[PDB]
Amino acid sequence: PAASPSALKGVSQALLERIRAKEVQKQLARMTRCPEQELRLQRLERLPELARVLRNVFVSERKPALTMEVVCARMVDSCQTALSPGEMEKHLVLLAELLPDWLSLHRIRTDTYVKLDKAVDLAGLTARLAHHVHAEGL
């Protein structure tokens, strides 16, 4: 013989207790996370940062075209912060998905390369990128 009783406590107790967690951060710090959400927002808003840095990276390279591995290596190296190589790649495809006139691909019998026009009005790109129509954080 056994049983499994239950009850409910749907009241602002557990809501107000989130205040007290701000003191417990120095004491326990075990699954204690709430204000840390700002990192998620700070990560998703790098949209313009990646676009500007990309342009800069190509500009300083003295060449508007780079090999598949060269641009890849050049982008993944930026991971020396607090993210995986996947988030980098996700950004590469997202950009290209709305920037078919900025970014290009040229497959050659020796290797594959990318083309990028550093004279295109980035401001127009910032807007048409901030549109978030089909991006869904690609």
Curated annotation (Swiss-Prot):
Cytoplasm recorded as keyword: no
Positions of the UniProt region annotated as Interaction with LRWD1: 44-138
GO cellular component: kinetochore; nuclear body; nucleus
PTM annotation, UniProt: Two independent E3 ubiquitin ligase complexes, SCF(SKP2) and the DCX(DTL) complex, mediated CDT1 degradation in S phase. Ubiquitinated by the DCX(DTL) complex, in response to DNA damage, leading to its degradation. Ubiquitination by the DCX(DTL) complex is necessary to ensure proper cell cycle regulation and is PCNA-dependent: interacts with PCNA via its PIP-box, while the presence of the containing the 'K+4' motif in the PIP box, recruit the DCX(DTL) complex, leading to its degradation.
Any one GO BP annotation for this protein: positive regulation of DNA-templated DNA replication
Keyword Phosphoprotein recorded: yes
Keyword terms of this UniProt record: Cell cycle, Centromere, Chromosome, DNA replication, DNA-binding, Kinetochore, Nucleus, Phosphoprotein, Proto-oncogene, Ubl conjugation
Single GO molecular function: chromatin binding
Superkingdom of this protein's organism: Eukaryota
Subcellular location(s) per record: Nucleus; Chromosome, Centromere, Kinetochore
Quaternary assembly: Interacts with GMNN; the interaction inhibits the binding of the MCM complex to origins of replication. Interacts with MCM6. Interacts with CDC6; are mutually dependent on one another for loading MCM complexes onto chromatin. Interacts with PCNA. Interacts with LRWD1 during G1 phase and during mitosis. Interacts with NDC80 subunit of the NDC80 complex; leading to kinetochore localization. Interacts with KAT7. Interacts with ubiquitin-binding protein FAF1; the interaction is likely to promote CDT1 degradation.
Family note: Belongs to the Cdt1 family.
Comment block on domains: The PIP-box K+4 motif mediates both the interaction with PCNA and the recruitment of the DCX(DTL) complex: while the PIP-box interacts with PCNA, the presence of the K+4 submotif, recruits the DCX(DTL) complex, leading to its ubiquitination.
Function: Required for both DNA replication and mitosis. DNA replication licensing factor, required for pre-replication complex assembly. Cooperates with CDC6 and the origin recognition complex (ORC) during G1 phase of the cell cycle to promote the loading of the mini-chromosome maintenance (MCM) complex onto DNA to generate pre-replication complexes (pre-RC). Required also for mitosis by promoting stable kinetochore-microtubule attachments. Potential oncogene.
Protein name: DNA replication factor Cdt1
